[PDB]
Amino acid sequence: ALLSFERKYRVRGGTLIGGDLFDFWVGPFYVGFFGVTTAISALLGTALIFAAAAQGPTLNPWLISINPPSIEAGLAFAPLSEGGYWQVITACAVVAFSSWVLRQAEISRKLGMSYHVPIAFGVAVFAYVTLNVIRPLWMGAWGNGFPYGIWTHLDWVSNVGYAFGNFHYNPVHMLAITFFFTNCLALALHGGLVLSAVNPTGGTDVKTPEYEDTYFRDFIGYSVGTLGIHRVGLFLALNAGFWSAICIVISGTLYVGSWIEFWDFWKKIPIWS
Amino acid sequence: CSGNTASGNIAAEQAAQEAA
Amino acid sequence: AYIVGTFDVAELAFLLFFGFFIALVFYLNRESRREGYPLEDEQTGKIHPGSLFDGDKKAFQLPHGRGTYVPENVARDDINVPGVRSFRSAGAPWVPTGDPMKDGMGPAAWANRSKYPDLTFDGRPRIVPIAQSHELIIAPNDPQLIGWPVMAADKKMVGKVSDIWVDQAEHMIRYLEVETTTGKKVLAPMMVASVHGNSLIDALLPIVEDKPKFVEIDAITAAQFEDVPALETPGIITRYEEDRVQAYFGGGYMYAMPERAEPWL
Amino acid sequence: YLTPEEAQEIHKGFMGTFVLYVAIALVAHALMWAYKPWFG
Amino acid sequence: YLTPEEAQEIHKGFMGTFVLYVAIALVAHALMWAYKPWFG
Amino acid sequence: YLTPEEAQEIHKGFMGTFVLYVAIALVAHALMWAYKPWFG
Amino acid sequence: ATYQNIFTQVQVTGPPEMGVPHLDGSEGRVELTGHNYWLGKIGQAQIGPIYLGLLGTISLTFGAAAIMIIGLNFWAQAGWSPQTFMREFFWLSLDPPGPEYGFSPFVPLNEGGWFIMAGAFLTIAVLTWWARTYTRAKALGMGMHIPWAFASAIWLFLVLGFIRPMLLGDWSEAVPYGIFSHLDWTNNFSLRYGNLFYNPFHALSIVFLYGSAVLFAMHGATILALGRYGGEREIEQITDRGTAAERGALFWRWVMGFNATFESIHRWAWWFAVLTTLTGGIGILITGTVVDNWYLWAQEHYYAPETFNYDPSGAIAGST
Amino acid sequence: MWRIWFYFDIRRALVALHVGLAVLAFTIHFILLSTDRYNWLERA
Amino acid sequence: MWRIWFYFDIRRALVALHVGLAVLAFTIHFILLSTDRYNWLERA
Amino acid sequence: MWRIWFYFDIRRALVALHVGLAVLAFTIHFILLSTDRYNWLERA
Amino acid sequence: MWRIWFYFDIRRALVALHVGLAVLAFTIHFILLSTDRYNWLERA
Amino acid sequence: MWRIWFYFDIRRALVALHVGLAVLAFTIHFILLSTDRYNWLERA
Amino acid sequence: MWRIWFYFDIRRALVALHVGLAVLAFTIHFILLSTDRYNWLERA
Amino acid sequence: MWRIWFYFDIRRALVALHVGLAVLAFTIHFILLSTDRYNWLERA
Amino acid sequence: MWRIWFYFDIRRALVALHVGLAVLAFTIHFILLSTDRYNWLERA
Amino acid sequence: MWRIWFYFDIRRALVALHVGLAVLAFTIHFILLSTDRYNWLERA
Numbered sequence A: 001a002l003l004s005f006e007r008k009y010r011v012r013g014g015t016l017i018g019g020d021l022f023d024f025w026v027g028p029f030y031v032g033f034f035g036v037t038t039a040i041s042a043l044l045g046t047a048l049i050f051a052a053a054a055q056g057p058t059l060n061p062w063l064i065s066i067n068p069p070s071i072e073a074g075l076a077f078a079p080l081s082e083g084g085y086w087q088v089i090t091a092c093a094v095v096a097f098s099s100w101v102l103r104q105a106e107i108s109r110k111l112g113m114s115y116h117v118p119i120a121f122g123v124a125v126f127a128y129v130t131l132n133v134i135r136p137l138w139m140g141a142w143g144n145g146f147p148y149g150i151w152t153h154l155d156w157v158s159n160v161g162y163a164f165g166n167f168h169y170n171p172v173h174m175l176a177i178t179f180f181f182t183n184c185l186a187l188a189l190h191g192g193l194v195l196s197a198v199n200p201t202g203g204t205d206v207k208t209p210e211y212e213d214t215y216f217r218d219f220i221g222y223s224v225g226t227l228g229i230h231r232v233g234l235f236l237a238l239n240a241g242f243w244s245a246i247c248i249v250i251s252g253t254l255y256v257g258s259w260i261e262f263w264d265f266w267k268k269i270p271i272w273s
Numbered sequence B: 001c002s003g004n005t006a007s008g009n010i011a012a013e014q015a016a017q018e019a020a
Numbered sequence C: 001a002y003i004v005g006t007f008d009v010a011e012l013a014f015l016l017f018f019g020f021f022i023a024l025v026f027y028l029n030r031e032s033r034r035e036g037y038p039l040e041d042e043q044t045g046k047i048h049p050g051s052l053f054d055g056d057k058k059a060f061q062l063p064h065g066r067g068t069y070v071p072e073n074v075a076r077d078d079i080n081v082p083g084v085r086s087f088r089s090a091g092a093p094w095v096p097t098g099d100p101m102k103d104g105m106g107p108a109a110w111a112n113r114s115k116y117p118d119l120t121f122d123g124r125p126r127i128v129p130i131a132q133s134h135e136l137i138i139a140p141n142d143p144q145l146i147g148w149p150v151m152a153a154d155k156k157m158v159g160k161v162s163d164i165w166v167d168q169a170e171h172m173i174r175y176l177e178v179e180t181t182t183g184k185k186v187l188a189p190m191m192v193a194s195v196h197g198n199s200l201i202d203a204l205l206p207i208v209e210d211k212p213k214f215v216e217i218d219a220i221t222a223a224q225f226e227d228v229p230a231l232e233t234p235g236i237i238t239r240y241e242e243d244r245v246q247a248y249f250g251g252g253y254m255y256a257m258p259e260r261a262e263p264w265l
Numbered sequence D, E, F: 001y002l003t004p005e006e007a008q009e010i011h012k013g014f015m016g017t018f019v020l021y022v023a024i025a026l027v028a029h030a031l032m033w034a035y036k037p038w039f040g
Numbered sequence G: 001a002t003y004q005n006i007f008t009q010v011q012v013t014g015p016p017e018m019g020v021p022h023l024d025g026s027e028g029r030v031e032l033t034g035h036n037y038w039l040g041k042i043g044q045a046q047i048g049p050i051y052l053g054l055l056g057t058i059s060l061t062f063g064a065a066a067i068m069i070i071g072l073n074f075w076a077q078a079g080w081s082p083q084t085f086m087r088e089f090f091w092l093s094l095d096p097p098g099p100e101y102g103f104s105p106f107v108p109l110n111e112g113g114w115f116i117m118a119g120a121f122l123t124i125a126v127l128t129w130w131a132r133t134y135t136r137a138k139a140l141g142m143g144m145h146i147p148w149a150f151a152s153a154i155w156l157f158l159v160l161g162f163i164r165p166m167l168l169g170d171w172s173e174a175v176p177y178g179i180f181s182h183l184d185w186t187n188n189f190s191l192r193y194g195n196l197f198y199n200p201f202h203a204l205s206i207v208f209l210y211g212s213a214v215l216f217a218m219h220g221a222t223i224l225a226l227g228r229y230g231g232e233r234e235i236e237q238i239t240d241r242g243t244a245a246e247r248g249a250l251f252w253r254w255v256m257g258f259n260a261t262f263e264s265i266h267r268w269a270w271w272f273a274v275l276t277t278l279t280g281g282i283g284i285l286i287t288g289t290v291v292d293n294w295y296l297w298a299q300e301h302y303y304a305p306e307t308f309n310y311d312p313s314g315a316i317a318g319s320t
Numbered sequence H, I, J, K, L, M, N, O, P: 001m002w003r004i005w006f007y008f009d010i011r012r013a014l015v016a017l018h019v020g021l022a023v024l025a026f027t028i029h030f031i032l033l034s035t036d037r038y039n040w041l042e043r044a
């Protein structure tokens, strides 16, 4: 009951698992059963990250890298110093993200809201699971996963991308990039329009939604509306995440080779060649 | 995770595949 | 490329942006503190002092001659809520003493909104029955919805649809008027109403189907429809009344039946 | 301010501090010129 | 504030602490100059 | 606080804690200087 | 059974709304209006009307000129063959002048003159479009947030096309007009300058693009989940706090311990979106002009990994 | 005939005409600068 | 002691405890499978 | 003891139990398939 | 000393304490498993 | 026949016609300038 | 001095202090484990 | 001249002036630092 | 002097001061640890 | 010069001034540390 209106909303119920067992708050944070699971998994994952780092060549936070086992090890559980730490941290991260989704669902139920936020975050959880669980399983080795390091997973991204020639020629990658760019443009437009509506110039009063409609019809000839903009932004962000997961999952499992050669299909269409 | 050990997988890749 | 020693232009730009971003985060927190602050104690309700980095209060120049808003001056909620803590701790939930839907607790809670209706840019009431709108009609290929049966959360037929309320600014249906068995007319949010018999896939499907065309409201039961908050003036709904109706229907997803508040197990 | 006399008072303060600031800057620039001139 | 008297008191306190701060900085700069001059 | 009495009490406590903190830091810095000086 | 606020079930149709009157001297809206039923499923079905002042006319004419120049150069590159045009469209490109020309404004038309002309006309069109968004905001008494957000993207665009080539004195550093060609330019730009991953401003721009995706996902999901309480009517919630604003704040306060307001969230979104292109333009401008090898620069600042930190040979071998 | 001005506002027509003239003139001057024969700034 | 049931409900505690026991048992079994000494499937 | 069914819904309990049993059985079968000793499909 | 229970409720305190104890115990056991000296499973 | 102006508004028709004619003339001049036989600016 | 409790709530102060102490202690132990001089698990 | 105070608020003008002066001074100092002739920290 | 407490809340001022002091102390300690001259953990 | 306190809140002015002084002094100390001439930690 910190916020001036918070107290009346802090009621029992809305939990999926646990009921009244963990139905309480700790400061601003609601816990629930999935909050307990999130706390355990996330704290264990962080502690194991730092335990594996202490066994590594450096404690520099830039250069800390918890690496997966070698490809020759296949899909077996490796020794902790030889990639097992990475596997345990991956399991902890999966559990933590799933528990975060379920805690968001419980909090949505407590406030009389639908499950839009848990589903939206579950899209990103699916992207991560595709990156570090599904793709290594399909490829046959845990060594295909990206390392747990701030700058070494960028090295993983670079090397995996260049293993296919130029990763820019992946068409699902093109679609995901288009969704990302359109999302950022849409977010700029939506934030700017709302702020300009509530922060007028020239000493005028706060505007109505008719003013936003008029502004975007004078600008580009069309206005999507107040509900439509949030629908479109959610669609764009979720599509960006989902198509990122799809684009990475098919490279190395379904498509092997240079993505540049794929576009030789276009030149062979009998309509123009 | 599979039912094998990492050492067994590495030995199989080296000897049974990369050595013969 | 070095400015002095190992300092270079790129490093200087990065450090400048890092400082700017810290300042921007502080500014964004200041902006986020404008509603609901200062904080208060969970039990005693004692108000916390206030941030050292806060500035001046924000004043909104309202249209239609409604004055200034000043969100920092919004009256704090009453400390005495119609509930009792499940256990005596700062983090325990409140169990409502009576009817949460009537008293406004948890998902059924409402805010003290303005007691006058929202207006269009020219001063007309924004949310009005579709007859009072300015030549606004339902899409001819869309469901008419007038006279359709209404299903409640307990699968009972509470009544029928007698009127449609539309937003004159956004050109959207906001409320459906439902006449119940007892004859009382109540407003139900369109966002809690599922329209059946108008599926896009079913239209695409090459079938001849006599699906029942009705409106389902699974938020509240048929009896609860008799306790929907009423309007002070016909044909007009205020912001406070809108909040009342929306809170009453939204709280039903937890409070319509006891099982809705229980874990799956 | 609206009243002119307040405008004269604000102007007096502003010009006094501006002259002091410019004098400090001029002393610094003269010292730099004596140290390492940028014209020649 | 509004009353000129408490404004003068505030200015007194601010000037005192500013003078102390500047004196400390001046001592530090004199020590650094005696150690490693930067103009020469 | 609002009253001068509570303000003076707060200042007294703050000054005592600050003096103790500075004394501890001075002892630590003197030990570090006797160990590995950073000037010379 | 439960409405999820994804598609509009029943649409409301009426006479087209021509907009609030302008507060300045405007010529008058071109009353070309339409209605799209399928756009009304997601948002608003009304198309139009449009405003075409001096700025809109200039922008449309100069952008048409630039696009015509690029397309006619594509047709010439295809040998005027429609089939070759279709076959090689992705590979057609209007390329910048070669390094032997420096940053000279005088290049033969087929060697880069058309490229310079198209760049000039495109820049004129983009700048007049920015001026048009500024004047459209001014005509309604609204704020200038959208003009500044557009100015950030224009800053990145101008750094890519004109400012950086001007500073390096090399037209050949500019981005070619082509689908696959500008991707090739991106890849080559990363390759010649070490590795753009280690540009700290490229990393910052990635941070802000990712965060904008995150922010839009969270904000759209929150607003749609708050449709039961009028969450999408954000202007009224900002100027008169309802239960939707309270629930939206409390959800994120209970999730992560802190929350924004209905206005503050849009400031967060605006700043993330703007900072993406701001940091991107800053990072591109300093590449080559200030730093020529970003991996070396990262090595000097102790954040460049080696093989003893992580060896990517296995990941490469798996992907072959 | 003057009757053309019964269907087109003179202000809009003049604005569009002068915008088109500006694009045409800039294009022609740029093309002339692109050729060594007509470039009047590179050499004496 | 039995008084622990005055602050925690048996129905929810049983579910939470069994979930934790399941995860712990799976972790221990997988750890055993990763060692050549105790792996019971790869070799005879 | 049938007391359990007074506090746990039989339908939810059965669904959860069968989901868990399915996941466990699939995991064990896949683990057995992964090993050369117990794989029953690759070799005669 | 008992007055600590005047400021912290037993339920949340016990939940947090056991979460922390679980995290710490798993961390220490994993760290011991990662070292050759204290690995009790790999060798006889 | 003049009756074509009963079905077509001449403001829109004239605007579209003048835009299309400008595009067509620019395209033809560009094609001619692209050929060595008809280029009139490269050489004397 | 005891008067510090008139401005700071003991419950919030103790929880903030112990979270900080935990993080600092874990940081120090992890730093010591990294160095071979102070590592107490790798060798006898 | 004093009439300038009838057109610009003193607080806003002073704040903007000092922000601009700070930015200009920092820019000039950094530019001087980058030059070899005027760097005062590299060498004696 | 004491009058500073007529304008600053002691709780907020103390919290901000201690946050800044913590950041400063950890920064200085890490800087000293990163130098071979003042590192007190690697060598004997 | 006391009249400035009629235009600026003392708490906000003091907080902003102290933040600016902290940032500037950290910048100067960091710049000095980055020069071999003035570095006081790396070497004796």
Ligand code: BCL
Pocket: A097, A124, A125, A127, A128, A131, A156, A157, A158, A159, A160, A161, A162, A166, A167, A168, A173, A176, A177, A180, A240, A241, A243, A244, A245, A247, A248, G186
């Ligand atoms: C040399 C490099 C290659 C390249 C090779 C690759 C490869 C390989 C990959 C991509 C992928 C991507 N590339 Mg690419 N890519 C290139 C050039 C580009 C360019 C450009 C302008 O040139 C752009 C815009 C992109 C953009 C993209 C995106 C489409 C995508 C990354 C987004 C994503 O995955 O979100 C999805 C979001 C997630 C995966 C994150 C999920 C978040 C989790 C669930 C939550 C984390 C919680 C955290 C621990 C909490 C801690 C916080 C606090 C501590 C509490 N690439 C070049 C050609 N690219 C990746 C992709 O599409 O796969 C997914 C992919 O794998």
Ligand code: BCL
Pocket: A157, A181, G067, G070, G122, G126, G153, G154, G156, G157, G160, G177, G185, G186, G187, G188, G189, G190, G195, G196, G197, G201, G202, G205, G206, G207, G209, G276, G277, G279, G280, G281, G283, G284
């Ligand atoms: C091999 C590829 C390289 C790489 C090389 C580059 C290069 C080069 C650049 C980036 C840039 C970026 N990279 Mg990269 N990048 C890599 C891998 C990645 C990965 C990953 C693997 O996951 C990601 C997420 C990214 C992400 C990003 C973005 C954050 C950033 C550009 C975003 C943007 O604002 O949109 C793009 C937005 C614009 C371009 C603004 C456009 C606005 C204008 C006004 C629009 C005009 C349109 C016009 C009117 C339409 C008509 C035109 C006519 C038809 C002609 N890169 C690797 C390392 N990347 C850019 C940057 O700024 O970073 C420093 C950049 O220049």
Ligand code: BCL
Pocket: G061, G064, G065, G068, H016, H017, H020, H021, H023, H024, H028, L018, L019, L021, L022, L023, L025, L026, L029, L032, L038, L040
């Ligand atoms: C070797 C070829 C010869 C040549 C052979 C011919 C032949 C044959 C013909 C012309 C005709 C024309 N020639 Mg010639 N012409 C040559 C070189 C030139 C040069 C030059 C820079 O050297 C110019 C300016 C012109 C100009 C012209 C026009 C006056 C006329 C085409 C206009 C038209 O059809 O209306 C169409 C346009 C409109 C009705 C509206 C346009 C008005 C606007 C305001 C003007 C801007 C136009 C511009 C293209 C806009 C660019 C923006 C676009 C979006 C791309 N010629 C060379 C020297 N020329 C034609 C003619 O005499 O009359 C038809 C014709 O038959």
Ligand code: BCL
Pocket: A043, K019, K020, K021, K023, K024, K028, M018, M019, M021, M022, M023, M025, M032, M038, M040
């Ligand atoms: C070479 C180093 C020596 C060593 C030298 C020292 C020295 C010197 C000292 C200690 C001290 C401590 N050592 Mg020792 N110590 C060593 C190895 C160990 C090992 C081990 C590897 O198994 C353990 C478990 C410990 C344990 C401890 C603690 C009992 C004690 C810190 C008390 C404390 O307040 O914790 C902090 C934790 C809390 C306050 C929270 C309570 C913890 C509960 C269980 C919750 C855990 C939290 C969870 C794991 C994650 C949450 C993190 C945040 C809250 C978000 N040492 C090695 C052998 N050790 C210190 C001491 O005696 O202080 C009194 C001390 O001065």
Ligand SMILES: CC[C@H]1c2cc3[nH]c4c(c3C)C(=O)[C@H](C(=O)OC)c4c3nc(cc4[nH]c(cc(n2)[C@@H]1C)c(C(C)=O)c4C)[C@@H](C)[C@@H]3CCC(=O)OC/C=C(/C)CCC[C@H](C)CCC[C@H](C)CCCC(C)C
Pocket: A038, A041, A042, A043, A044, A045, A046, A089, A092, A093, A096, A097, A100, A104, A117, A120, A121, A123, A124, A147, A148, A149, A150, A151, A153, A237, A238, A239, A240, A241, A242, G210, G213, G214, G217, G218, G221, G255, G256
């Ligand atoms: C539409 C897809 C996009 C998306 C959606 C989005 N993100 C979201 C949400 C949504 C809708 C949330 O509701 C959720 C949230 O609650 O934010 C406040 C969240 C979130 N997005 C987050 C991060 C994030 N999202 C990312 C991506 C995306 N988010 C997308 C592009 C990225 C990228 C691109 O990498 C980041 C880093 C967090 C801020 C938050 C998730 C909070 C969470 O998962 O809580 C668990 C608690 C923890 C303490 C984390 C677990 C700790 C681990 C066990 C240890 C670390 C393991 C990790 C694998 C180490 C590896 C790191 C290295 C790569 C450096």
Ligand SMILES: COC1=C(OC)C(=O)C(C/C=C(\C)CC/C=C(\C)CC/C=C(/C)CC/C=C(/C)CC/C=C(/C)CC/C=C(\C)CC/C=C(\C)CCC=C(C)C)=C(C)C1=O
Pocket: A026, A029, A030, A031, A034, A035, A036, A038, A039, A042, G211, G214, G215, G218, G219, G220, G222, G223, G245, G248, G249, G252, G255, G256, G257, G258, G259, G260, G261, G262, G265, G268, K015, K016, K017, K019, K020
């Ligand atoms: C309009 O409505 C909206 C708002 O306000 C009304 C919003 O605020 C928002 C939210 C948005 C913002 C406030 C803007 C800022 C957000 C950004 C940049 C994106 C998120 C990124 C971040 C880095 C933020 C921080 C993210 C986190 C995951 C931090 C989480 C931290 C912690 C400590 C979580 C702890 C909680 C748990 C583990 C669960 C509970 C368990 C416990 C308490 C443990 C108990 C046991 C012990 C031992 C203590 C939205 C989206 C919105 O739409």
Ligand SMILES: COC(C)(C)C/C=C/C(C)=C/C=C/C(C=O)=C/C=C/C(C)=C/C=C/C=C(C)/C=C/C=C(C)/C=C/C1=C(C)C[C@@H](O)CC1(C)C
Pocket: F009, F010, F011, F013, F014, F015, F017, F018, F021, M001, M003, M004, M007, O010, O014, O017, O021, O024, O027, O028, O031, P025, P026, P027, P029, P030, P033
């Ligand atoms: C580049 O960076 C490096 C390399 C590090 C170099 C540069 C470093 C730089 C620039 C550093 C600059 C540092 C700096 C620049 O000012 C530091 C200032 C520190 C100061 C002012 C510290 C002051 C501490 C005061 C303390 C701890 C006071 C505590 C008081 C308390 C707790 C009192 C409590 C109370 C009591 C008992 C009784 C109650 O009745 C009243 C109440 C009051 C509640």
Ligand SMILES: COC(C)(C)C/C=C/C(C)=C/C=C/C(C=O)=C/C=C/C(C)=C/C=C/C=C(C)/C=C/C=C(C)/C=C/C1=C(C)C[C@@H](O)CC1(C)C
Pocket: E009, E010, E013, E014, E017, E018, E021, N025, N026, N027, N029, N030, N033, O001, O002, O003, O004, O007, P010, P014, P021, P024, P027, P028, P031
């Ligand atoms: C490129 O960059 C490098 C390389 C660094 C080169 C360039 C550097 C440049 C350009 C630097 C420029 C710097 C600069 C350019 O102006 C600095 C100005 C500093 C100033 C003006 C400092 C002033 C300090 C004043 C202080 C500390 C006052 C404190 C007062 C206090 C705390 C008073 C409290 C009070 C008291 C007791 C009693 C109460 O009753 C009233 C109250 C009042 C509450």
Ligand SMILES: COC(C)(C)C/C=C/C(C)=C/C=C/C(C=O)=C/C=C/C(C)=C/C=C/C=C(C)/C=C/C=C(C)/C=C/C1=C(C)C[C@@H](O)CC1(C)C
Pocket: K001, K003, K004, K007, M010, M014, M017, M024, M027, M028, M031, O025, O026, O027, O029, O030, O033
């Ligand atoms: C760079 O980093 C490295 C490498 C690590 C180097 C640097 C390290 C640095 C800078 C470290 C700095 C550390 C630091 C800098 O101050 C630490 C300070 C620690 C302090 C002040 C610890 C204090 C602990 C106090 C405790 C545990 C008190 C507990 C009291 C309790 C539980 C009392 C309960 C109670 C009881 C019984 C009865 C009830 O009636 C009343 C009530 C009260 C409820």
Ligand SMILES: COC(C)(C)CCC/C(C)=C/C=C/C(C)=C/C=C/C(C)=C/C=C\C=C(C)\C=C\C=C(C)\C=C\C=C(/C)CCCC(C)(C)OC
Pocket: G067, G068, G070, G071, G072, G074, G075, G105, G116, G119, G120, G121, G122, G123, G157, G158, G160, G161, G162, G175, G176, G177, G178, G179, G182
């Ligand atoms: C159907 O056929 C027709 C011909 C009718 C239509 C054809 C239409 C087609 C097919 C068009 C296709 C276009 C395509 C595919 C374009 C793709 C472009 C891409 C992907 C571009 C990407 C990036 C481009 C950038 C960043 C460009 C920036 C350029 C700038 C900023 C240039 C500035 C130049 C200036 C300021 C001019 C200076 C002039 C000077 C120096 C002389 O004086 C100041």
Ligand SMILES: [Fe+3]
Pocket: A190, A194, A230, G219, G223, G234, G266
């Ligand atoms: Fe919004």
